[PDB]
Amino acid sequence: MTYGIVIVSHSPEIASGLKKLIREVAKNISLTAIGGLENGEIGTSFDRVMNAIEENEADNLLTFFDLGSARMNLDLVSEMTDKELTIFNVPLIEGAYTASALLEAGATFEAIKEQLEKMLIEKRSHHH
Amino acid sequence: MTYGIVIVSHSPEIASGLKKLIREVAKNISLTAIGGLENGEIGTSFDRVMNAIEENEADNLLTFFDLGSARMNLDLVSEMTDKELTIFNVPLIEGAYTASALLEAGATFEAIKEQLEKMLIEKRSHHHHH
């Protein structure tokens, strides 16, 4: 089964920088990232989350996000894709980085989930 | 006693983007952010972290960081300033954002700590690069 990592942020700079941070230890994984709105402003959109999902070469996507206000769009995309999304309610940086490094190292999905379970947090924050 | 927020990342783009994200909810707080080495590499350095600390108008700094490999530098900088750093073992984005919004609203220091208590996490990742 193929796995990939998707990062969604309210900020294009967060997404960009996190992707680079991850790539320094995970050059081989299937990784996509998106942040902000089409005009570079802070936010998320259905279309841009959808594109990050569809852009990823893998069909089983471990998906990470920053603020609680992003969860809606991920859930909307989840309803409409043939990909299998696993959305994790974990910190964006620490969770995506940990998952990415494990995936790169060859960890199984169950092993990755076990580690991410330890990081579940309440994702209550919202952007206005 | 005034308080400010400091963001430290291995990435200059994460630091800048998080600052910008926070400024949408917290326009008035004393907030500084830095990431990367002087030479542009991903990482953290003593001097750049020190600059973010010294540039912050506040003397009591609630300090947030991304990966465990940043913690040593923060501890070293803490030794080398008269400012009082409170370093949180919490997620960088969600921690700094939550604390910044509370600070902006006029929450007390104890009230900020109260809300960050549920965010306490082990910060065990250590960055590498070749």
UniProtKB/Swiss-Prot annotation, chain A:
Record GO biological process: glycerol catabolic process; phosphoenolpyruvate-dependent sugar phosphotransferase system
GO cellular component, one term: membrane
EC number: 2.7.1.121
A GO term, aspect molecular function: ATP binding
Listed Gene3D superfamilies: Phosphotransferase system, mannose-type IIA component
Pathway given in the UniProt record: Polyol metabolism; glycerol degradation
Residue numbers annotated as active site: 10 (tele-phosphohistidine intermediate)
Residues of the PTS EIIA type-4 domain: 2-123
Alphabetic keyword roster: ATP-binding, Glycerol metabolism, Kinase, Nucleotide-binding, Phosphotransferase system, Transferase
Reaction equations catalysed: dihydroxyacetone + phosphoenolpyruvate = dihydroxyacetone phosphate + pyruvate
Superkingdom of the organism of origin: Bacteria
Role of this protein: Component of the dihydroxyacetone kinase complex, which is responsible for the phosphoenolpyruvate (PEP)-dependent phosphorylation of dihydroxyacetone. DhaM serves as the phosphoryl donor. Is phosphorylated by phosphoenolpyruvate in an EI- and HPr-dependent reaction, and a phosphorelay system on histidine residues finally leads to phosphoryl transfer to DhaL and dihydroxyacetone.
Name by which UniProt lists this protein: PTS-dependent dihydroxyacetone kinase, phosphotransferase subunit DhaM
UniProtKB/Swiss-Prot annotation, chain B:
Catalytic residues as annotated in Swiss-Prot or TrEMBL: 10 (tele-phosphohistidine intermediate)
Induction data: Induced by dihydroxyacetone via the DhaQ-DhaS complex.
GO biological process: glycerol catabolic process; phosphoenolpyruvate-dependent sugar phosphotransferase system
EC number: 2.7.1.121
Keywords from the UniProt entry: ATP-binding, Glycerol metabolism, Kinase, Nucleotide-binding, Phosphotransferase system, Transferase
Every PTS EIIA type-4 domain range: 2-123
Reactions catalysed: dihydroxyacetone + phosphoenolpyruvate = dihydroxyacetone phosphate + pyruvate
Pathway info: Polyol metabolism; glycerol degradation
Class of the enzyme per the UniProt entry, highest EC level: transferase
Annotated Pfam families: EIIA-man (PF03610)
Domain of life: Bacteria
GO CC field: membrane
One MF term in the entry's GO annotations: phosphoenolpyruvate-glycerone phosphotransferase activity
Disulphide-bridged cysteine pairs: none
Domain notes from UniProt: The EIIA type-4 domain is phosphorylated by phospho-HPr on a histidyl residue. Then, it transfers the phosphoryl group to the EIIB type-4 domain.
Other observations noted: Unlike the carbohydrate-specific transporters of the PTS, the complex DhaKML has no transport activity.
Chain's role: Component of the dihydroxyacetone kinase complex, which is responsible for the phosphoenolpyruvate (PEP)-dependent phosphorylation of dihydroxyacetone. DhaM serves as the phosphoryl donor. Is phosphorylated by phosphoenolpyruvate in an EI- and HPr-dependent reaction, and a phosphorelay system on histidine residues finally leads to phosphoryl transfer to DhaL and dihydroxyacetone.
Protein's UniProt name: PTS-dependent dihydroxyacetone kinase, phosphotransferase subunit DhaM
Source organism of this protein record: Lactococcus lactis subsp. lactis (strain IL1403) (Streptococcus lactis)
